[PDB]
Design a protein around this ligand. Structure first.
Ligand SMILES: [Cl-]
Ligand SMILES: [Cl-]
Ligand SMILES: [Cl-]
Ligand SMILES: [Cl-]
Ligand SMILES: [Cl-]
Ligand SMILES: [Cl-]
Lengths: 337, 336, 338, 337, 336, 337
C-alpha cells in the first residue's frame, strides 16, 4: 500500500534529477494480456517508457481488443526488422559460438523477443526489461544470464519483499540456485543487504535452517558457515545462523531462547538453504499469509532485468515494473560514475 | 472454532466411555509454559495430566506461578515409581544389542522423556506431550526408540494451517531431512487419513520449486511420489510436482495446468525436504496471520507429540487438545 | 553399386504397393543441399518429398537455384496446416508433465522439426530427413520426444562402411555417450537385424582397446555385452572384448585368439562409447577410401533419420534412399499390426 | 614408402655426422622370427647395431634355422650371465623396494629380457630398445616405464602416423592412458607437435570429441580445456577444440561451419579424448583405410624405447626400428650439448 | 616392576612440590571395581580420590563391601556442589552454538561424567578416571566436549604392552575409526612424546597387512603416514608400511627388508584403523602372557582417561597410577 | 607341543588305513633353504612324499650344500621338461584365455613352479602343495586361486591356530579378503567351524569388532549381521557378535557384562572384520604372546594348497606341512565318495 507508492515517488525524484527522463523498459511479450493491462496503469503514472516486442500489427490489434486507448503510442519493435538485428546476431554468436550455437541458431535465438530484449538492454538500447509472464522461469532467465551476465563476484539470485505492518522482509534466493554453498549464501545475503540499505533500512540477516544453532552436519553447518563468511565480509551488519525461521523473525523468541545471538530486533533479511524452501515459502505466504509479496527480482546481474513468476497477477506485474524502473535508474547512475 | 470443535469431540468420546479422560504424561513437570497451559486445559476437562519430576519441585513451581487448579494433579518421580524397575528391564531388553547396558538403561529410564515414552508404551498412560524445553531431536528419540513406528509407517511431523473456510495440512515438518519418493508417498497417506478423520476429503500436492517439469532431483522425486501415492490410494486427488501457489490456488491450477488431476486446491501439502517444511510452517505461523497448530508426530504406534521449542502457552494448549483426540482414537483401536 | 541395389528395392517395394512412393517430409525446406539432393532423387522415383517452410520462401529458393524438377513438390507451412492445432494438442499432452506449457507446445509445433516428427507420428508422412542445418541433438530431440523408441529398443546411430566386397556396420555413432553392457547388446541386436534385412549374416564384435582381457572398465563391459547378446541371439556369432583389427581381420583372430567364436571377420562393430564411434566413422569417411553412408537412427518406432551436420549433397542422396527403404518397411509393420 | 626412405636417409645423415657410429638397439625377443627377419634388412641398411637378448645358444640356433647369414656376428647377450647383471638387480631393487618387490623378485624381473633391455638403455649400455612383438602392450611397456621413466612434465603416450598423399597425420595417445585429463591431453599434444616439428612441418592441433565447439560437460568440456591449456603453453601454435574428426581434418568443413576457429588448413595432429577412441581409430584406419599407418611409437619417456603392437608385421618392425634409431640419435645429440 | 617405578615417580614428583597429591575425580562413585581399586591406591599414596554421587549412597556401598580405607576419601554430589551453576554457565558457553540450550546444559552437568570433566577443566581437580560402568563413547564424549584437544592434537587411545625387557606402545586403540595418513602421523608423534617421557628412544612402525608394497588403500596410507611423520620428527626412526611381525622383530626386518630405516625393532605401533588396534591390545591382554595397561587418552588439554568397560580391579589400579603421572606432568606445563 | 604330535599321529592313522600311502605334496621352491631343512625333519616323520620343483641339478646341488642326506631320493620335477607340460599349458590357457592370457603367456606361467604345482594338484598328479616361503602372499596365492579355485559358495580365507594350554583358538580371515561383507564373514565362520569340528571340538564363534553389541553403522552393524546370517546357516552353533575381542575369548566378561549373549564358555573361532585386524593380530600374538601360532592355512579351495607366510621359520614350515598332509588326506577321501 504505502511501500509501493513510496517507490513510485522515488522514481519521480530520480527522474526529476535527470531532466525528466524515464527509464526505457522493454517487454518481450508484447501480446501478453496481463502485461498490457499492467502497462495501462503504469503509463498514467510516468514510471517508464515501455517498449513492446512483437509484430506491430499483432500488438496494436491486441491493444484495441482489450480496449486500452492509453497505449496507442507506445514504442513497438519487431526483432527481425530492427536495424540492429544483424549486429545483435553477430554479438550473440560471438558470445556462444564455443557453447554449441551455430550462426543459424544465433539468428533464430536473436529473433526470439527474450534474447532481443536482453541484447537491447546489454547494448544500451533499453535501460531494463521485464519478461516471463507467459513462460517458465528457466526459459525466461537463460537469455538474461547468457547475454547480460552477472557482475563481478556476484551471483544471480531471485529476491522477494514481504510487506508487513510497519516493516518489510526480504527473502532470497527464491528462483535461481537449487542448493547454494555456504559461500553462495553469504554472497546472496550481501546482495540482499545492499538492497535493504538502499531503502534506508538496517539489514539484519538470518541464515535459515531447520535447526537452532546446532551446527550439525548438512544445512545447519552450512548456514552457520554462511553467517561467518558474511560477517567477515560485512563486519558492520547483524548476521546470524544457523537458526529456524520463527527464531529469525520474532525478536522475543530469539532473546528468550538464544540470548547469545548477535541478531537483535528480528531479521529483515532471510537467506534460505535451498530452492525448495525459498520457493515454497514466498509462494505460500503470498497465497495464504495475507501479506503482499512482490517479486521475485533478479539480483546479481550487470543490468536491470527481472523475470516475473509465471503465476503473477496483473498487480504483481505492476509492482515488478515499478521496482525494475528503480533498478534501471540506479544502475544507470553507477555506470555514469 | 476448529479448536472448539476438537474440544467437543474429546468430550463426546469420553461420554461414550464412562466419562474417562485420556491420561497425558508431561515429562517437563516444572516447565512454566506447560504448567500455565495445563491451567487452561483442566478447566476444559481435556485430559488427566501426569507430571514427571520431583514432587516438591513441581508443587513449589505450581505455587510460584499461582495456579491453584493444579493442586490435585498427579505427579510421578521416575526413579521412585513402582514400575521403574520393570521399565528399566523393558528398555534394556529392547536396546541391549543397540549399545545399551543395564546400568545405562537405568539412567535413561530416570529421564522423564524415556519414562514418559515407556509409560505410554506399556499402557500406563494414554499419551504424552514433551519437547517444550529441549530441541526436537532430543525429545523425539526416546519416543522412536521406545514406542516405534507402526508397520510400513514413517515418523513425520504434521501441522494444521487454520484459514477461514478451511485447514491446510503440512508434512513432514520435523523428522526426515530428505525423504525419498517412497517416503513422501507414505507421508501423504498418513496425512490424508488424518484429514479424513475430520470429515474432509483430502487433496494432495507434492510440492517442489517446479510446475510439472519432472526434471532430475526434487521435481522428478515429487512427481514419482504423487504416482506412488496415486497407486496406493486410487480414490484420492494426488498430484505433483508443482509449486506451492499452484497447489493451493484452484484458479491458478485450472488456468495453467488444466490436465492436472487436482481440482479445488490442495489441503494436504507434502514437502520435498525438511528445510522447506520446517521454514514454511514457521513463517506462516509468525507472519501469515493464520493459526498454525502442531507439529504432531504421525506414524508412531501410540500417541506421542513433541512440541516445538518455540511454542507459546496457547500453542501447548492447542497441541494437548489434539493429543487427547489422538489418545482416544488409538485407545479404541487397541481394544479390538 | 550398393546404393543402386537399394534404389531397385525401393522400386520393388513400390511395385506391389500400387506404385505408391513413401512420403518423406524435410523440415529444412530452403536448405540448398537438401534441394539439390531432391533433384537427383526425384529422377529416381525414390520418394514423394514434402518440404516445410513458407511456400514463397521455398519457391524462391528453388527458382534461385534453378531446379525445375522441384516446382511441383508439396510445400507445407506448419502454422498454416489444417492439423496444426490438433498437432499442438498431442505434443502438449505428450510433454505437459515434462515442463512444456500450451504456449510452448504451440511454438515447438511451429518449428518444422517438431511438425515433421508429428506428421510422421500421425501417418501424414511415412518418414522424415532432417539435420543438414542444425546440430544432431537439436535435430534428434523432437524425433525422440514425439515418435519415441519401440519396446526394448534403444535409439542409436548406425553407419555403413562400403568396401570392395563387403560392408561393415558401425554403431552407436550418434546417441549414447557411454552405453551400458545391456545397451551395447541391444545396439548389436538392432544393427544385426539391419544386416539381415540385406541378406547378409551378421557377425558382431564388441570393440575395446583390449584383446580378451575382461579387465575392469570397458574390457569387462564389452565382454559382458557380447555374453548378453549371445544369450538373446544364440544363432549369431558375437564376440568381445577385442581390438578393432582383431575384429575385422579374420587372419589376426585365427592366429592370436583361435578360441574365439568369431570367424571370417566381423561385419557389425559395436562401440564402447560415443567418442570412439563418432570419431571412427568420421575419420574413415575423410581419410579412408571407402564410402560411408549414414548415420541412420535405429530403434525408433517410425522412420526418421538425422543427417550429420557435416554432410554433402551425395550424403543426403544416400540417406534419403535408405530412409525410403526404412519407411516402406515400417509401413508394412504398421499395416500388419493395423 | 617415400616417408620411410626419408627417415632412413636421416639416420644416415646423423650417423655420417658422428664418425659413422650407429645407435645400439637391444631386442629382448632374441628368437622372435619376425624380429630376426626384419633385422636382416636393418643391418644391410646400416640402421642400428642390434643386440639380441637370449640364450646365445638358441639365438644362433634360431638364426641358422631361418638361414639369415647376415646376422651371425650381431651381438647376443644373456641377461643372467652379463657382467652388469647383479649391479642391474640392485638398481631395480632400490627403485621398487617400497613398491612390493623383494630382492629375489628383482632378481627374477632383471632376468627377464624386457627388464634387462630397459636397464641397459637407462644406464647407457644401449641407446634404445624395441620390444613387444610376442607379448601384449601393457606387459611390454611396464618395464620401460618402471626403469626408464618419463622426462620432467612428460606423459607416456603412444603416437601413430597416417601417411597420406601430400602429408601425414599423427594420432595420440593410441596406447597408454585410458582417460587423460585436460592437462594430460595438453601435454600429449605438445609431445606430438615437437615430433611433427622434427620433420619440418607446422603442427596444427585438433582436440577431438563427438562435439563441434559445444564445451558441454564431459569430454566436450575436457577437449575445449585441453586446447586452452596447450595454447597457453605454445602461443605460437594453431591448437583448437572441441571438434569432431571430419571437422578437424577437412579445412573446408571447418571454414564453412566454424569460421571463428583458430585452426586453418586442416589439423595434422589429432589428440583423442580416451583410449577407446584412439586405439580403435588407428586400427580401423590401418585395416579398412587404404593409407599406411605406422607405429605406435612411445613418446614422453626419458630414453629411446618403443613397444611394437603385438599385431605388427615384419615391415612394421622395420619401420619401428628406424624411428627408434632416429629417436636414439636425437636424444644422443641432446645429451652432447 | 614398570608399575613400581611409575609409583615411585609419583611420590618423587609431589615430594618436589610440597607433598601434594593430585586430585583424581571418579564419576562412578558406587562402582564396585573402582572402590576396591581405590583401597589399594589409598595405601600407595598415589592421589586424592574424589568420588561423585549421593554421599550416603556412596558411604553405604563402601562399608557394605567392607572397604575400610575409603572412610576419609572426599565425596561430592554434582547438583549440590557450590560451583555447579558456574559449571553450568561454562558448558552452555562452550556448546551454545553446538545445539545445547541452558536447560540441557543443566541436566548434563548433573551427570557425573560432565561434572567430573568440568572440575578438571576448571582446575578443581587435576584429572579424572571414568568408564568402568559405561561404554567408551558415552564416557569419552563429555571429556572431549568439555576439556577438548590441544592445538594440532588428535584424541587417541594408547596402551602399553609390558614385555620382559621392553614395552611396546599401541595407538590409537579407542578413538578414530579410520585415521588418515595425516592423523596416523599425529598419533605417532603423540605416542613418541609419551615414550620419550620414560627415557626410551621411540621407534615407530606404521602397521599394515602389507610389507612395503605401498599399494592403494591402507598400504599407501601407512607408507604416506610414515613420510609425514618423518617430515615432522627427522630425528626419529619411523617406517612403513609393514606387517606386525616385521615391525617388532628386528631380525625379520634386517633379513627381508634391509633398506628399512627402522632397526632394533619398533616400540611404537600405529594402527591403520580401529578394528586392528582395538582387537590387538585386547587379544594380547587375554591370551598373551604380558601385562597390558590402558587405554590412556592422549591429545587432550588436561588429564582424563577412560577405563575400558572390560577392565579388572588391577587394570583400574594401573590406570590410576599413570593418570596421576599425566596429571602431575600437565600441571607443571600449565604453571609456565 | 601335544597338538602337533596329535596331528602327526592322525596322519599315520590315515596312511595305515590306506595301504601306508603318504600324500604327495609339491613344493615349488625346490632350492629354498628353509623348505629343505623343514623337509629333513618331515621325511623321518612319515608325513608325506615331497615333490620338489626346479632344475634337478640345481636342487641336488643345494641339498648337498646344506648336507641333508635324507633328501637324496626325493622326487624332483622340472616343469617345462615334464611330460604333462603341454597338456597343462593347454588347460591353463583354456582357463584364462578370456582374462588376458595368450597361449605364449600360458607357457611362461606354466613354467613357473607355483603355477605348475597348482596344476599338478588340480589334475591329481599330486595331493597338495606348500608354497610361498620365498615370495609375497598375493604372488603365491594367485596361481592357486586361478587354477584350483574355490568350492561352491566357498570363499578363500586364511586361518591360523593359536595353541593355548587348555585350548586352541582359530583366527580368520588372516590373509585374503581386505574387507569382507557380512555374507563373506558368515561364510568365513562356517569354514573355520568345520575345521574345528574336524578336531572333535565344539566351535563357538565370535564376530569381532571394536564395539560391544552396539550394531552401529559400519563395522559394528556388519559383524552383528554376520552373526545373524551364520546362525541361520548353522542353527546348532553358538555364534555371536558384534563384540570386542576380550569379550569374545573371556567367558566371565561375557557372562558379567552381556548375559543375554548366545555365546557361553568363550569363543574358540574369531572371525575378523577386515584384513588389517586379522593379519596384525595373529602376527602380534605369534611374536609377543607366549603361545604357538600355526598357519596360515588356505580355506575355501577345492584342493589342498597352503601358502606359508613370507616371515615363516623352519618350524613354521614343518607345522604347515603336517596340517597340509592331513588336509590332503581328508580331501582325497571325499573325492573317492
Ligand atoms: Cl517456473
Ligand atoms: Cl529443535
Ligand atoms: Cl553435431
Ligand atoms: Cl595389447
Ligand atoms: Cl566400549
Ligand atoms: Cl606378504
Amino acid at each position: 500500500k504505502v511501500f509501493i507508492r513510496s517507490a513510485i515517488n522515488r522514481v519521480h525524484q530520480n527522474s526529476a534529477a535527470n531532466g525528466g527522463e524515464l527509464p526505457r523498459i522493454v517487454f518481450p511479450e508484447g501480446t501478453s494480456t496481463k502485461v498490457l493491462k499492467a502497462l495501462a496503469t503504469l503509463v498514467e503514472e510516468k514510471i517508464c517508457q515501455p517498449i513492446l516486442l512483437g509484430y506491430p500489427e499483432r500488438v496494436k490489434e491486441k491493444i484495441k481488443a482489450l480496449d486500452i486507448p492509453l497505449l496507442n503510442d507506445v514504442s513497438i519493435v519487431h526483432p527481425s526488422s530492427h536495424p540492429k538485428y544483424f549486429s545483435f546476431v553477430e554479438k550473440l554468436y560471438s558470445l556462444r559460438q564455443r557453447k554449441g550455437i551455430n550462426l543459424g541458431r544465433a539468428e533464430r535465438l536473436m529473433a526470439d523477443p527474450n534474447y532481443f530484449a536482453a541484447m537491447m538492454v546489454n547494448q544500451g538500447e533499453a535501460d531494463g526489461m521485464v519478461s516471463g509472464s507467459s513462460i517458465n522461469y528457466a526459459d525466461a532467465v537463460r537469455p538474461i544470464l547468457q547475454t547480460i551476465g552477472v557482475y563481478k563476484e556476484g551471483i544471480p539470485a531471485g529476491l522477494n519483499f514481504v510487506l508487513l505492518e510497519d516493516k518489510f522482509l526480504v527473502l532470497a534466493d527464491t528462483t535461481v540456485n537449487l542448493n547454494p554453498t555456504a559461500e553462495q549464501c553469504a554472497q546472496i545475503a550481501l546482495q540482499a543487504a545492499k538492497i535493504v540499505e538502499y531503502f534506508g533500512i538496517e539489514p539484519r540477516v538470518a541464515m535459515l535452517s531447520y535447526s537452532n544453532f546446532s551446527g550439525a552436519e548438512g544445512t545447519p553447518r552450512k548456514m552457520k558457515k554462511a553467517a561467518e563468511i558474511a560477517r567477515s565480509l560485512r563486519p558492520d551488519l547483524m548476521i546470524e545462523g544457523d537458526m529456524q525461521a520463527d527464531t529469525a523473525v520474532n525478536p522475543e523468541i530469539m532473546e528468550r531462547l538464544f540470548p547469545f545471538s548477535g541478531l537483535k530486533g528480528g531479521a529483515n533479511v532471510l537467506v534460505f538453504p535451498n530452492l525448495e524452501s525459498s520457493n515454497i515459502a514466498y509462494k505460500l505466504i503470498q497465497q495464504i499469509g495475507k501479506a503482499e509479496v512482490i517479486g521475485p527480482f533478479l539480483t546479481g546481474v550487470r543490468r536491470s532485468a527481472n523475470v516475473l513468476q509465471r503465476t503473477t497477477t496483473v498487480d504483481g506485474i505492476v509492482n515488478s515494473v515499478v521496482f525494475t524502473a528503480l533498478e534501471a535508474q540506479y544502475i544507470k547512475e553507477v555506470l555514469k560514475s
